């Protein structure tokens, strides 16, 4: 152990099976719907479902799923035939603004806003339960 910064510098902090889509312009509430079916089953199925799921959010959710498998297979030296989504989840976003509607309490009322809210991330592990 030693102390705080000792631990800090003897250890570099890995992130196995992890990858994240930041800032995809889309509403996370939507994206959760796509994601919820993926979560828990084998990354193969995940690729299939995602190929065939009619939501447009399905698109960048698949794009990420592979990167996180791709990270798992290369950086973590894992086994793609043991691979499954350990976890996935979506939130956040610096919800977009140009602030072009300068608002004098009137005449445009309230409209717009375009959430950047995506932040899609997925995490892969090996089953090994068998």
């Amino acid at each position: 152990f030693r102390n705080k910064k000792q631990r800090k510098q003897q250890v570099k902090l890995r992130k196995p099976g992890f990858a994240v889509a930041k800032y995809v312009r889309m509403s996370p509430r939507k994206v959760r719907l796509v994601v919820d079916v993926i979560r828990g089953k084998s990354v193969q199925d995940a690729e299939d479902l995602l190929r065939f799921i009619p939501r447009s959010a399905s698109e960048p959710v698949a794009k990420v799923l592979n990167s996180a498998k791709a990270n798992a297979l290369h950086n973590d030296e894992m086994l793609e035939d043991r691979l499954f989504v350990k976890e996935a989840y979506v939130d956040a976003g610096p919800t977009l603004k140009r602030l072009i509607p300068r608002v004098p309490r009137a005449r445009g009322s309230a409209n717009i806003i375009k959430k950047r809210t995506s932040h899609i991330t997925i995490i892969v592990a090996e089953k090994g339960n068998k």
Binding site: L33, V34, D36, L49, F52, I53
Partner: protein, 56 residues
């Protein structure tokens, strides 16, 4: 006129959203190009539906 009275709570609201749960496609692997296709349509991969159809 007719506006809502209070905000709705997180609890009752998600209770409303109880039903929006997505149905994931029930898939099947294609007998020909061995990739997963969708029932009563063409396998997007080979193009085969009973013998062969689209050119992909």
């Amino acid at each position: 006129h007719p506006v809502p009275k209070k905000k709705t709570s997180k609890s009752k609201r998600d209770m409303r959203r109880s039903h929006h749960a997505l149905t994931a496609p029930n898939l099947t692997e294609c007998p020909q190009c061995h990739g997963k296709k969708l029932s009563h349509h063409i396998c997007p991969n080979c193009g085969y539906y009973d013998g062969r159809q689209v050119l992909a």
